[PDB]
Structure 1
Amino acid sequence: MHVKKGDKVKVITGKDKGKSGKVLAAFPKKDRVLIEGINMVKKHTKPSNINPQGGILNVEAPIHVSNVMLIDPKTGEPTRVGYEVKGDKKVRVAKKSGE
């Protein structure tokens, strides 16, 4: 996966195409990403110990990784990513000669 937890994201396709957000979790076992404010769902949950009043809950749902491009940190555009050896560790370098 080219996207990790804590990065900034621009969504490319889907019903919520064209917006931005910050990744909250990653599921590399199944190629899913959870981004705040994207792909909200309404869960009909019974009352229980969690959320004692129950009711309809409005929470995010995971989306596929391919629907996500990592925005350029300095300029602010989605871009493909490349790897360079800086120091003794591999860093991620954009296609606009950035980080």
Structure 2
Amino acid sequence: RVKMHVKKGDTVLVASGKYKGRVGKVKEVLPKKYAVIVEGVNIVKKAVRVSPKYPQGGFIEKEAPLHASKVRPICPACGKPTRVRKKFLENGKKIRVCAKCGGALDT
């Protein structure tokens, strides 16, 4: 209950510490623990030579987690938080003046 952040599954840059100012994609909200997984923390893992799936060379990964509350919106600009207008019918959380919500697909 009340798990609402403001990080949509879309595309959004990073105003962080490590990968400050970094371009990241759909981010994949995971989950309620308040974390992201965009295209930032690309680390290698220390798994074993798991004879089938991790063949004879176990020492690899892909995209590693990272916290949510560090990434920020995008439109005809960059960041600038999203603001919601009730559109009478549906929703419209365009960007700080410079428009476009995010849900898209005839939104």
- TM value normalised by structure 2: 0.76
Q: Distance in 2 between matches of 1:53 and 1:96?
A: 54
Q: Match for 1:3: what amino acid?
A: K
Q: Residues 74 and 95 of structure 2 are in contact (CA less than 8 Å); yes or no, is this contact kept in structure 1?
A: no
**SS of the counterpart of 1:3?**
coil
Aligned ranges for residues 1-99 of structure 1 at < 5 Å? 1-5=5-9, 7-36=10-39, 38-48=40-50, 49-72=52-75, 75-86=76-87, 88-99=89-100
Identical counterparts, % of pairs: 31
Q: Deviations over 1:23-72 (max 9, x none)?
A: 24112310001102x11112011122322234221422122111100112
**Corresponding pairs, count:** 95
Unmatched tracts of structure 2, length 5 or more = 101-107
Once superposed, what is the RMSD of the aligned Cα atoms?
Answer: 1.7
Separation (CA, whole Å) in 2 of partners of 1:91 and 1:53: 51
Normalized against structure 1, the TM-score is what? 0.82
Query: Conserved in 1, the CA contact under 8 Å of 2:73 and 2:95?
Result: no
Long gaps (5+) in structure 1:
none
Q: Which has the higher strand share?
A: 1
Q: Which stretch of the first structure deviates more once superposed, 49-58 or 18-27?
A: 49-58
Offset of 1:82 from its aligned partner? Answer: 0.9
